[PDB]
């Protein structure tokens, strides 16, 4: 037929529009500013007790409590300041690969190879943590989940789809389709109206939560996208891929802005996160280290070493005070 | 120093630590088996010879040893993105039906089921996450394979075959064909067994293979190996 020809000419038109839009380059524009210097942080706290591989962590909105998910079927809630354990939730399925902490602080979500997103209530009158909901409907593993509010959650799965749920009813209010490969991560915009997802088809997509349709599609990675995170401004996001590069995409410009790669680095990125100002882009790697990049210069600015295995997750507090990194060696480290 | 509520919180954290350590001690005494194969390999038989919508966990006990067998047949997603979750598994049980050497895939794409099983076995055996993990290979439907082979020759799946159509000869040839895919023969061990539907010695075979794996792990731990 001719439909694929129409798709090809639309792609060529979009490529030409982006090229015309690409009047300059961020790297050459940022020559005027000065480098941030050698960023050198220390391990303030070492949270230990999972005794198994750690796949996910998430900070609380109060920047003090954090939840951590491990393969020994445990969700541990930590008081980061005092290293105390607040709760230890035993999971029904130990193959958890994601976790989230509600912005209000009342609920914690986790999901894994069981394809079910479990929502646990932390503020109960019985004094224990209990499963408040079990969202089912995905036909693949759950790779990420983020709370929008106290009653809405977005999940990404291995069935190449994302789903916006209603926790009270337990049904997919919205379904986002369009990815070809497995969706491995998602990031909510600060205004919560949009989110972005990266998939194994080496592409990222911008989704409108209310409309339930893809706004923009960003490409450029040669391999799977394992992590994604919004710039604090909300007008850009960084993708960490398995091709040993990180990339910065701008929503309005609809184009890649900058690439963070080094010849010495050949392993894939497992997690990315910005700093509060957005000047530092932290990326965890398979080489057991976490590189801190000058987000505006692309020059590496620091190295967080101290994990004996792959850095699987990392997050920056809302106030920007600390960075917590979990890893396959069953420890979390807090750097400042 | 610490306020009263701070000390009480510390005590609560200590009790949580005690419970976590007890749970880990209990879990470390468990044998983990990853069950793999094709759609009609015979996993539905190996289960229900062992135990009397994503991953399926089967729990059983044998001679004071606790086994957790994980079946990931439901997962239709990309295996590369979740296989490393089973890196520390004690053993892999691979199931394949002998009676599929002539049958073609359900898609009827002129692809032999036996060749697909061999390709999957090659992918799993020569995997970065499974380099020293022993594989307990099960060749299922032996009597059905006999019935199928007395009429049809094994040359349908293996045109290079230069032997007779005797059941023993063809079974040995198929076992050798599967075992030759083991690239690192010095480290990984492949245990092969034959059973169709009625043998009650499969749990004994798995127990023996797991005992050997535990002995090897203990030798590595003790510094003798």
């Amino acid at each position, epitope marked *: 037929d001719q439909l694929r020809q129409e798709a090809e000419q639309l792609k060529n038109q979009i490529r030409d529009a982006r090229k015309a839009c690409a009047d300059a380059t961020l790297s050459q524009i940022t020559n005027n500013i000065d480098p941030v210097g050698r960023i050198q942080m220390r391990t303030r706290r070492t949270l230990r007790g999972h005794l198994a591989k750690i796949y996910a962590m998430h900070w609380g909105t109060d920047s003090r*409590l954090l939840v951590s998910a491990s393969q020994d079927g445990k969700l541990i809630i930590w008081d980061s300041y005092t290293t105390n354990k607040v709760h230890a939730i035993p999971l029904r399925s130990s193959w958890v690969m994601t976790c989230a902490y509600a912005p209000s602080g009342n609920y914690v979500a986790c999901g894994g190879l069981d394809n079910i997103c479990s929502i646990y209530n932390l503020k109960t009158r019985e004094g224990n943590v209990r499963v408040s909901r079990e969202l089912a409907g995905h036909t693949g593993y759950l790779s990420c989940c983020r709370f929008l509010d106290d009653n809405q959650i977005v999940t990404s799965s291995g069935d190449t789809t994302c789903a916006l749920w209603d926790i009270e009813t337990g049904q997919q209010t919205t379904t986002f389709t369009g990815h070809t490969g497995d969706v491995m991560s998602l990031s909510l915009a600060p205004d919560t109206r949009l989110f972005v997802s990266g998939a194994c088809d080496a592409s990222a997509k911008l989704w409108d939560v209310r409309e339930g349709m893809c706004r923009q599609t960003f490409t450029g990675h040669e391999s799977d996208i394992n992590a994604i995170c919004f710039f604090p401004n909300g007008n850009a996001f960084a993708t960490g891929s398995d091709d040993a590069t990180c990339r910065l995409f701008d929503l309005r410009a609809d184009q890649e802005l900058m690439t963070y790669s080094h010849d010495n680095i050949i392993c894939g990125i497992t997690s990315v996160s910005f700093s509060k100002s957005g000047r530092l882009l932290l990326a965890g790697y398979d080489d057991f280290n976490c590189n801190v990049w000058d987000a505006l210069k692309a020059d590496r600015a620091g190295v967080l070493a101290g994990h004996d295995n792959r850095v699987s997750c990392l997050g920056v507090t809302d106030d920007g005070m600390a960075v917590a990194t979990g890893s396959w060696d069953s420890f979390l480290k807090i750097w400042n | 120093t610490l306020s009263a*509520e701070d000390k009480a919180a510390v005590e609560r954290s200590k009790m949580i630590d005690r419970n976590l350590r007890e749970d880990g001690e209990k879990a470390a005494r468990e044998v983990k088996l990853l069950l793999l194969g094709a759609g009609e390999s015979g996993k539905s038989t190996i289960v229900k010879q062992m135990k009397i919508t994503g991953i399926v966990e089967t729990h059983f006990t044998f001679k004071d040893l606790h086994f957790k067998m994980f079946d990931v047949g439901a997962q239709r997603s990309e295996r590369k993105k979740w296989i490393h979750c089973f890196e520390g598994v004690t053993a892999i049980i691979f199931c394949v039906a002998l009676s599929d050497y002539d049958l073609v895939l359900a898609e009827d794409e002129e692809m032999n089921r036996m060749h697909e099983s061999m390709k999957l076995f090659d992918s799993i055996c020569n995997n970065k996450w499974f380099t020293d993990t022993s594989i307990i290979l099960f060749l299922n439907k032996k009597d059905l394979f006999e019935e199928k082979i007395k009429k049809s020759p094994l040359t349908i799946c293996y045109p290079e075959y230069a032997g007779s159509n005797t059941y023993e000869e063809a079974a040995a040839y198929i076992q050798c064909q599967f075992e030759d895919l083991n690239k690192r023969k010095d480290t990984k061990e492949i245990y092969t067994h034959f059973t169709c539907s009625t043998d009650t010695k499969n749990v004994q075979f798995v127990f023996d293979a797991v005992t050997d794996v535990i002995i090897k792990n203990n030798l590595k731990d003790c510094g003798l190996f």
Partner: single-chain antibody
Amino acid sequence: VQLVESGGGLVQPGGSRKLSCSASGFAFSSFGMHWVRQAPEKGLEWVAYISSGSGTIYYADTVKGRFTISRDDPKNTLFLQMTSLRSEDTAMYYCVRSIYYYGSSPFDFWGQGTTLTVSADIVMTQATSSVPVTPGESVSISCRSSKSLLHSNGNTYLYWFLQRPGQSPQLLIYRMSNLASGVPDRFSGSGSGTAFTLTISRLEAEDVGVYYCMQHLEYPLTFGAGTKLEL
């Protein structure tokens, strides 16, 4: 959530009684438990405390040695064995649950209490003992501490309790700023070290009762005198 006590009655001095409180509707083993007494015409008085898992046990000096607090988790029961009862041990005894972690709400639920009759360093001061009020107007109740309750970690350990006539006291505010769950937003707490205020805006008939301020900085666990409101 239910805590019911038994073992009260009339006792001659020098006798012994076992007060037993049975708990249901919550995870008993994960809660610390307190015994708190109520004199027939006086205010509250902390008696004993046993932590979750029985790790730590604390007693008041006036009951030291005579009283033994214990818990039996499988049966979800709390015991207070009292020996050589004096005439001042007559009171209504309440059993209180309290769980301690970051952001928890200790002393949130109180038992009904059992009546016992015997037939022969921090001082918390409430300035006023009785305040007549009318519905509709805001009311302020003041409490003062002989020692600053503001700990170095930033938490000021002051708790407010309200005892309605014929009912057990309930938690209103914990750590002098946090409103307990289920308490209307009319109640508010404020102040600084050694000077605290509880504000009841748009007072209603239900708010009539006795208001207590208690400190949790150390373990004498001293209560306030008790400010009573009338109509």
